[PDB]
Amino acid sequence: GAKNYYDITLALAGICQSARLVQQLAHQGHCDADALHVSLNSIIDMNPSSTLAVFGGSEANLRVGLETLLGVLNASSRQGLNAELTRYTLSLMVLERKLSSAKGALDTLGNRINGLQRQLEHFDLQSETLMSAMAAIYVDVISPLGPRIQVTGSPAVLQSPQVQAKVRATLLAGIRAAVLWHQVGGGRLQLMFSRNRLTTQAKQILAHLTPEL
Ligand SMILES: [Hg+2]
Ligand SMILES: [Hg+2]
Ligand SMILES: [Hg+2]
Ligand SMILES: [Hg+2]
Ligand SMILES: [Hg+2]
Ligand SMILES: [Hg+2]
Ligand SMILES: [Hg+2]
Ligand SMILES: [Hg+2]
Ligand SMILES: [Hg+2]
Ligand SMILES: [Hg+2]
């Protein structure tokens, strides 16, 4: 119901999940399939009873994002791997605010997203066809509204048009999570003032996911 750190943490975990999947992709050319399936499905599922239902109704679906979030909030080096994750997450947040403020853009985007039903009729969500249709939406709708997210990794890997397509489609997911984040009370100032509460809540969810330990 009312603004709470549990929902804010999940939505933040979605933005970090996008960021981390882009990073696996750019360095290795492959990413966690289960996490990507979750992130891609959050773009298209128009049934959102709760924040968590956006990601399929299970906390396990965001594990990647929750673990990433812990470094993005706290480790915060200016170099190395974690500094890439931080730069991607802040770029996503800056782009979503441009999208939210740009007269008309959010209506356009919703229509373009619903329009993936044209392709989903004949092609699965993870196909090269869907990946390129979702990348086209990111590129046509979102990327002109602000600074480009500069993606770094192995340059040879990144010349693949299929890697490029998946990158862009996953960036669309991170935008979709940032939209949710603001819808559940999240924002810039909240994030500067509530860090330890987000970190603690994410640690709690990961402990809840791992009763083995
Ligand atoms: Hg994040
Ligand atoms: Hg690398
Ligand atoms: Hg990926
Ligand atoms: Hg993947
Ligand atoms: Hg089709
Ligand atoms: Hg058809
Ligand atoms: Hg048809
Ligand atoms: Hg989106
Ligand atoms: Hg906001
Ligand atoms: Hg439980």
Side-chain angles (χ1 to χ4, degrees):
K3 186 195 288 149
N4 61 98
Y5 293 122
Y6 185 84
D7 285 336
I8 297 183
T9 296
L10 296 178
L12 284 162
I15 300 177
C16 277
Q17 192 145 297
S18 178
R20 178 57 176 149
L21 291 173
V22 168
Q23 178 184 68
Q24 295 172 348
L25 268 151
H27 288 288
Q28 280 154 300
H30 301 287
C31 67
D32 183 335
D34 291 339
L36 176 71
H37 190 244
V38 167
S39 287
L40 294 186
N41 278 5
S42 69
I43 298 175
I44 65 169
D45 210 355
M46 127 203 119
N47 303 82
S49 54
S50 71
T51 294
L52 188 56
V54 168
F55 302 104
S58 300
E59 289 170 340
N61 290 348
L62 283 163
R63 195 183 180 121
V64 173
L66 289 160
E67 289 177 1
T68 306
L69 173 160
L70 288 173
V72 165
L73 295 179
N74 304 115
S76 301
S77 200
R78 324 98 77 261
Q79 25 180 350
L81 288 180
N82 195 92
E84 309 196 309
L85 296 164
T86 299
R87 289 194 297 269
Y88 296 150
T89 47
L90 291 178
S91 290
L92 285 165
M93 283 171 180
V94 173
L95 205 55
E96 183 275 346
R97 302 253 46 64
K98 293 311 187 23
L99 162 65
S100 170
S101 63
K103 176 129 171 102
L106 273 164
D107 172 79
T108 291
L109 175 66
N111 280 294
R112 285 288 306 274
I113 283 158
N114 211 225
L116 301 157
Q117 289 177 96
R118 302 195 324 268
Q119 289 92 8
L120 285 171
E121 181 181 329
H122 300 129
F123 297 100
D124 285 325
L125 173 59
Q126 308 259 268
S127 64
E128 292 179 13
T129 296
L130 247 301
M131 221 63 76
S132 319
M134 291 183 276
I137 290 182
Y138 179 75
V139 173
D140 293 348
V141 178
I142 305 181
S143 75
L145 294 192
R148 7 186 160 178
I149 308 196
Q150 288 303 290
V151 170
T152 67
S154 163
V157 173
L158 290 165
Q159 281 186 326
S160 165
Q162 290 92 3
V163 167
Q164 283 300 131
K166 282 182 181 80
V167 163
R168 293 171 307 158
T170 300
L171 296 174
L172 174 60
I175 297 291
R176 189 268 138 69
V179 174
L180 177 62
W181 173 52
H182 285 275
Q183 261 153 27
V184 303
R188 227 177 100 277
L189 296 178
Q190 173 265 324
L191 188 61
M192 291 200 312
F193 306 150
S194 70
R195 195 187 280 174
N196 90 264
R197 298 298 293 277
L198 310 167
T199 290
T200 293
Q201 175 60 274
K203 285 177 176 198
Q204 195 281 155
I205 298 158
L206 293 158
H208 171 44
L209 292 171
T210 320
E212 307 95 290
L213 302 170

